[PDB]
Amino acid sequence: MNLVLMGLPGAGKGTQGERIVEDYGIPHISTGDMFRAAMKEETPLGLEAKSYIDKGELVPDEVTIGIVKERLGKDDCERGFLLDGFPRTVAQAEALEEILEEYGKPIDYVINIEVDKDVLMERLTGRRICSVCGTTYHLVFNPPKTPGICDKDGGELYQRADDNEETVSKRLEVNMKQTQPLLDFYSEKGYLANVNGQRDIQDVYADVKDLLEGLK
Numbered sequence: 001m002n003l004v005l006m007g008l009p010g011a012g013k014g015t016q017g018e019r020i021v022e023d024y025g026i027p028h029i030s031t032g033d034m035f036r037a038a039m040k041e042e043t044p045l046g047l048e049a050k051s052y053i054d055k056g057e058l059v060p061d062e063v064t065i066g067i068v069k070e071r072l073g074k075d076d077c078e079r080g081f082l083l084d085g086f087p088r089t090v091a092q093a094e095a096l097e098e099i100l101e102e103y104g105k106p107i108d109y110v111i112n113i114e115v116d117k118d119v120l121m122e123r124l125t126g127r128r129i130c131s132v133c134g135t136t137y138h139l140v141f142n143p144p145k146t147p148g149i150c151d152k153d154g155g156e157l158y159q160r161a162d163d164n165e166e167t168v169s170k171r172l173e174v175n176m177k178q179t180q181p182l183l184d185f186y187s188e189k190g191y192l193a194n195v196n197g198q199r200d201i202q203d204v205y206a207d208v209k210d211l212l213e214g215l216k
C-alpha cells in the first residue's frame with residue numbers, strides 16, 4: 001500500500017492521513033513535519049529549510065528529495081507508506097519515480113484532496129495544533145472539547161508560525177502553480193485519484209477508504 005497525499009495548503013492531508021495510518025499501519029511521511037522537527041532540534045537541515053518554510057516558499061528540491069529517499073528506505077516502509085506533502089513539484093515526482101524504482105515500490109495511488117482555494121485561508125488561520133501529538137483542530141469546524149488543549153493528551157494547542165494571512169497567501173500562491181502539472185503528471189501515470197475534500201472529515205475519509213480497500 002504505497003500512497004501519496006497531495007492538496008493545497010490546509011486541504012486536510014494531515015487530518016486524512018491520521019485515519020489512513022490508523023486503519024492500515026503504514027508510516028505517515030510528511031516532509032513538512034520532518035522539516036519542522038529538524039527546525040526544533042536545530043539540525044543543519046532544519047536551519048536551511050527554515051528560511052524557506054518561514055516565508056511560505058518551497059524548500060529546494062535536491063535536499064528535500066534527499067531526505068525523502070532516505071526515509072522511504074527504512075524497514076517500516078516494507079508494507080507500504082503514506083507520503084504527505086511530497087512530491088509538490090514535477091521534479092520531485094520524477095525523482096520519486098527513480099527512488100521507488102530502485103526500492104521496487106511503485107505508487108498505488110496519488111490521492112488529491114481537492115478543496116477550493118477560497119476556503120483555505122479560513123482553514124489555516126483557524127487551525128490549532130497539539131504541541132504534544134501534532135493532531136490538528138479548527139476553532140470552528142473541528143474544535144477541541146476544552147479550548148486550548150488536546151482531547152487526547154491534554155497538551156497545549158498552538159498556532160503554526162506560517163499559519164497567518166500573509167504566509168498562507170504565499171503558500172497558496174507557491175503551491176497553486178505546481179498543482180495542475182502534478183495532476184497532469186499522475187493523470188498520465190494512471191493512478192491519480194481525486195477526492196472531494198469539502199465535506200465532513202469522516203465522509204472525506206470514506207472516499208479514501210474505498211480506494212485503500214483494494215490494497216491489501
Ligand SMILES: Nc1ncnc2c1ncn2[C@@H]1O[C@H](COP(=O)(O)OP(=O)(O)OP(=O)(O)OP(=O)(O)OP(=O)(O)OC[C@H]2O[C@@H](n3cnc4c(N)ncnc43)[C@H](O)[C@@H]2O)[C@@H](O)[C@H]1O
Pocket residue numbers: 007008009010011012013014015016030031032033035052053054056057058059060061064084085086087088092123124126127128136137138139141142171197198199200201204
Ligand atoms: N516536498 C516539499 N518540497 C519543498 N518544500 C516543502 C515540501 N514539503 C514541505 N515543504 C515546506 O514545508 C512547509 C510546510 O509543509 P506542510 O506542513 O506540508 O504544509 P501544507 O502542505 O501547507 O499543509 P498543512 O499542514 O498546512 O495542511 P494540511 O493539508 O495537512 O491540513 P490539516 O489536516 O492540518 O487541516 C487544516 C485545517 O483544516 C481543518 N480540516 C481538516 N479537514 C477538514 C474538513 N474536511 N472540513 C473542514 N475543516 C477541515 C483542520 O482541523 C485544520 O484546522 C511548506 O510550506 C514548504 O515550505
Ligand SMILES: [Mg+2]
Pocket residue numbers: 013014030032
Ligand atoms: Mg499537515
Ligand SMILES: [Zn+2]
Pocket residue numbers: 130131132133134135150151152153154155
Ligand atoms: Zn495531542
